[PDB]
Symmetry: C2
Subunit: 166 residues, 2 copies
Amino acid sequence: AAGFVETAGNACEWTPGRYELSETEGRVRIPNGLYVKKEETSKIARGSCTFALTLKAPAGKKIVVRDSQQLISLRAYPQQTRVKAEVEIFKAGSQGAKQTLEIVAAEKAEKTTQYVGQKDVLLETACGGSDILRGNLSATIIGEGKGRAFAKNVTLDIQEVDCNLE
Amino acid sequence: GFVETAGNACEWTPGRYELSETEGRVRIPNGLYVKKEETSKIARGSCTFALTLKAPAGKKIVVRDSQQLISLRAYPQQTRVKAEVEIFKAGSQGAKQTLEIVAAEKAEKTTQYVGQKDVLLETACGGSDILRGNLSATIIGEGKGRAFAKNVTLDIQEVDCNLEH
């Protein structure tokens, strides 16, 4: 419940650094919100915000992380602008599933606002154990028009569970 | 109101089907099955649908909240499995979503719902529109792999035209 998060990258909306864990409404907010913008003066914009969440389970206790949810809003303006967000959460040393969301403005403005996340268990420490949960989040805007990719902080269900069997 | 499906990896025989509302949600039979053995380095498959929706008299048809269960399995070594799905009103843009896993030295799996919560299509009053859906998977690498998508379900509702703009 009481671990810590490191964020990094050139497109974090909130200043990258080390943050403390705080549970808002049973769900933990990780400050990995992302902001990437492109004008007509450039043919490409890219940005990323990554986090490393170190979780230490108390002795005889287990920490479990599930059900990530991140609100992603893509806006593309004509002509011929593509906006794509890629998100990936995983236990350090393990593989994860990668999700992407993309729109294209051809002749008129286009938008999409969606939640992206994995409903299932994302991480589970050993009893009294420690693990690191990482997350890559990135956006790429390519084309002739203006564009923006905005992601709100990801939220996670993190809960301490009783180790009480074998 | 009817749906036509097409494609080389549709699980159910591509053809013309009539729509029926199961629990207020319509199932489009665009389920996809794509498998790759160790005998080839790549497998690709797709299933697409065209759903023609005609609104009656002074009424409008509204389609929202798509949902498709996608299940990916990848086996080592260095094999990736990817699904891409896109629903959109014909002639308009849609948002494209992808789900992908990569087995390195260990087997990998993921099972997710993929869908758009917001309105996907809205006819004019007494109007006609076509909802299109592309769904496809790619398996790449030396190991075995499988991409399985269950049929898409959709919230389709008739609404009374009783205001004026």
